[PDB]
């Protein structure tokens, strides 16, 4: 049931080299794949091998697995390939910036988890599963597509020659499974708004402890949801030019929902586009700003990242203020 990459892809991508000039815009938060689409595999390939080691992973394995991955996003609007990326991409900046306070187990775990986050994502959130009976909502009662984003992960590794983790003694093996499964599920946005509040009280308290295995979990939870939303902290021409995608998936829902007699949400109505602007303004101010504040107490050399959803927040503003270039 998954696809699988052919052989001139993922050899292609083992003799694939980075441009020399983007090495050292690859290590900035805001950096912006979207003009380097033929080197996105690759780009995986060097964040891989400058955070974890050159020899983390078997080459072979390591393309075989990229490649596959990358066949089993769909072609949807939003939740697709490119998502993925520039998930990961975030995910390295934040681990280059706070490297040795993450185990090397974390970080190989946590690059691929980002990678794998939404495979085989078909533009449908987990409200329209649940609310029509999708069946993967009885097999997943709740965070649905994660946890079929899990599965679909579990799926790859599972296919001839892609498992990349084999070579981890079975201690090692199950506790990276693990990392990448409560990673994955911590993407479902309705568990971060409990695990925010959570981690914002343990840390004000000054209870916040990393080496306290549930904690540690929780700051990784809190790390994927910023990561997942990082669109809002580049620069905002792109943040726009994103944002033109998540809504072409949303209003896609949206048509499918009327077609089944329920009216959508009006974030999912293509007829409402004038409430944008405003619905934009609520996700940062309940969502966005409060995740990337927590994140920088946290660990502080992400504060990058909150400058610039703040930049942006203020961008969505000046849009509401008819001001708009
Ligand atoms: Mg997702
Ligand atoms: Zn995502």
Same mark, same amino acid.
């Given at each position: 049931?998954?696809?699988?990459?052919?052989?001139?892809?993922?050899?292609?991508?083992?003799?694939?080299?980075?441009?020399?000039?983007?090495?050292?815009?690859?290590? /900035?938060?805001?950096?912006?794949?979207?003009?380097? @689409?033929?080197? *996105?595999?690759?780009?995986?390939?060097?964040?891989?091998?400058?955070?974890?080691?050159?020899?983390?992973? @078997?080459?072979?394995?390591?393309? %075989?697995?990229?490649?596959?991955?990358? +066949? =089993?996003?769909? $072609?949807?609007?939003?939740?697709? *390939?490119?998502?993925?990326?520039?998930?990961?991409?975030?995910?390295?900046?934040?681990?280059?910036?706070?490297? #040795?306070?993450?185990?090397?187990?974390?970080?190989?775990?946590?690059?691929?988890?980002?990678?794998?986050? =939404?495979?085989?994502? $078909?533009?449908?959130?987990?409200?329209?599963?649940?609310?029509?009976?999708?069946? /993967?909502?009885?097999?997943?009662? #709740?965070?649905?597509?994660?946890?079929?984003?899990?599965?679909?992960?579990?799926?790859?590794?599972?296919?001839?020659?892609?498992?990349?983790?084999?070579?981890?003694?079975?201690?090692?093996?199950?506790?990276?499974?693990?990392?990448? %499964?409560?990673?994955?599920?911590?993407?479902?946005?309705?568990?971060?708004?409990?695990?925010?509040?959570?981690?914002?009280?343990?840390?004000?308290?000054?209870?916040?402890?990393?080496? =306290?295995?549930?904690? $540690?979990? %929780?700051?990784?939870?809190?790390?994927?949801?910023?990561?997942?939303?990082?669109?809002?902290?580049? /620069?905002?021409?792109?943040? +726009?030019?994103?944002?033109?995608?998540?809504?072409?998936?949303?209003?896609?829902?949206?048509?499918?929902?009327?077609?089944?007699?329920?009216?959508?949400?009006?974030?999912?109505?293509?007829? +409402?586009?004038?409430?944008?602007?405003?619905?934009?303004?609520?996700?940062?101010?309940?969502?966005?700003?409060?995740?990337?504040?927590?994140?920088?107490?946290?660990?502080?050399?992400? @504060?990058? /990242?909150?400058?610039?959803?703040?930049?942006?927040?203020?961008? *969505?503003? +000046?849009?509401?203020?008819?001001?708009?270039?």
């Amino acid at each position: 049931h998954m696809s699988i990459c052919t052989s001139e892809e993922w050899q292609g991508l083992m003799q694939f080299t980075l441009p020399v000039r983007l090495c050292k815009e690859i290590e /900035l938060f805001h950096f912006d794949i979207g003009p380097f @689409e033929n080197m *996105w595999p690759g780009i995986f390939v060097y964040m891989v091998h400058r955070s974890c080691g050159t020899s983390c992973f @078997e080459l072979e394995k390591l393309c %075989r697995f990229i490649m596959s991955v990358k +066949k =089993n996003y769909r $072609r949807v609007p939003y939740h697709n *390939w490119k998502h993925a990326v520039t998930v990961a991409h975030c995910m390295y900046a934040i681990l280059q910036n706070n490297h #040795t306070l993450f185990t090397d187990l974390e970080r190989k775990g946590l690059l691929i988890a980002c990678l794998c986050h =939404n495979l085989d994502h $078909r533009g449908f959130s987990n409200s329209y599963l649940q609310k029509f009976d999708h069946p /993967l909502a009885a097999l997943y009662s #709740t965070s649905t597509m994660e946890q079929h984003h899990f599965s679909q992960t579990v799926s790859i590794l599972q296919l001839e020659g892609h498992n990349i983790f084999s070579t981890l003694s079975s201690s090692e093996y199950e506790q990276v499974l693990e990392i990448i %499964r409560k990673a994955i599920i911590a993407t479902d946005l309705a568990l971060y708004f409990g695990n925010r509040k959570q981690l914002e009280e343990m840390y004000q308290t000054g209870s916040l402890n990393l080496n =306290n295995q549930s904690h $540690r979990d %929780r700051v990784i939870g809190l790390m994927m949801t910023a990561c997942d939303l990082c669109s809002v902290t580049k /620069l905002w021409p792109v943040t +726009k030019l994103t944002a033109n995608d998540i809504y072409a998936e949303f209003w896609a829902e949206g048509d499918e929902m009327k077609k089944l007699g329920i009216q959508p949400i009006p974030m999912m109505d293509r007829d +409402k586009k004038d409430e944008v602007p405003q619905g934009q303004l609520g996700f940062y101010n309940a969502v966005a700003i409060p995740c990337y504040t927590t994140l920088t107490q946290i660990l502080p050399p992400t @504060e990058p /990242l909150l400058k610039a959803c703040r930049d942006n927040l203020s961008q *969505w503003e +000046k849009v509401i203020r008819g001001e708009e270039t």
